[PDB]
RNA sequence: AAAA
RNA sequence: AAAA
């Protein structure tokens, strides 16, 4: 099985590539909420600053705007 | 299991051949960076010259 | 076939 | 449901 490279933005409802079971965490990859089992991305967010407050990508300290 | 001939350009989601865990090295198969453990492709690059500064395929001194 |  |  190969990972879908488009997830969490895959537009093919019949995509045969691997999608994580759990939806992406809307707190971002840097989510520190205890017990949160949503999928936390490891891919860094490309926006500087990022102003999407439901961005699932991984942010550094100060990257949020 | 044998290696995938098509990786990193394998479009078969059910591909049985093994795909390396590490992504291809952005420096190309000719990478000389010490300690670099990204996957260094062996198959040569067709583009003469390559224009992709992140082509993972193997180049030569006069393929810039 | 998700605009480099 | 296709990353500003
Ligand atoms: Mg694109
Ligand atoms: Mg197109
Ligand atoms: Mg868009
Ligand atoms: Mg886009
Ligand atoms: Zn997909
Ligand atoms: Zn979370
Ligand atoms: Zn972001
Ligand atoms: Zn393959
Ligand atoms: Zn390398
Ligand atoms: Zn090349």
Residue numbers in the entry:
A (entry chain A): 402 to 466
B (entry chain B): 402 to 465
The authors write:
The essential heterogeneous nuclear ribonuclearprotein, Nab2 (nuclear abundant poly(A) RNA binding protein 2), a conserved polyadenosine RNA-binding Zn finger protein, functions in polyadenylation, surveillance and the generation of export-competent mRNPs. The S. cerevisiae Nab2 protein contains four domains: an N-terminal PWI-like domain that interacts with NPCs followed by a Gln-rich linker; then an Arg-Gly (RGG) domain required for nuclear import; and finally a domain containing seven tandem CCCH Zn fingers that binds polyadenosine-RNA in vitro, contributes to poly(A) tail length control and is also a checkpoint for proper 3′ processing. Here we describe the crystal structure of a complex between polyadenosine RNA and Chaetomium thermophilum Nab2 Zn fingers 3–5 that are homologous to S. cerevisiae fingers 5–7.
This material was used to generate crystals that had P3121 symmetry with two protein:RNA complexes in the asymmetric unit. The final 2.15 Å resolution structural model had an R-factor of 19.5% (Rfree 20.7%) and excellent geometry, with a final MolProbity score of 0.85 (100th percentile). The final model contained two copies of Nab2 Zn fingers 3–5 (chains A and B) with three Zn atoms each, two acetate molecules, four magnesium ions and 25 water molecules. Each RNA chain bound to two different protein chains, probably as a result of a form of domain swapping induced by the packing of the molecules into a crystalline lattice. Nab2 protein chain A interacted with five nucleotides overall, with Zn fingers 3 and 5 each binding two adenosines and Zn finger 4 interacting with one.
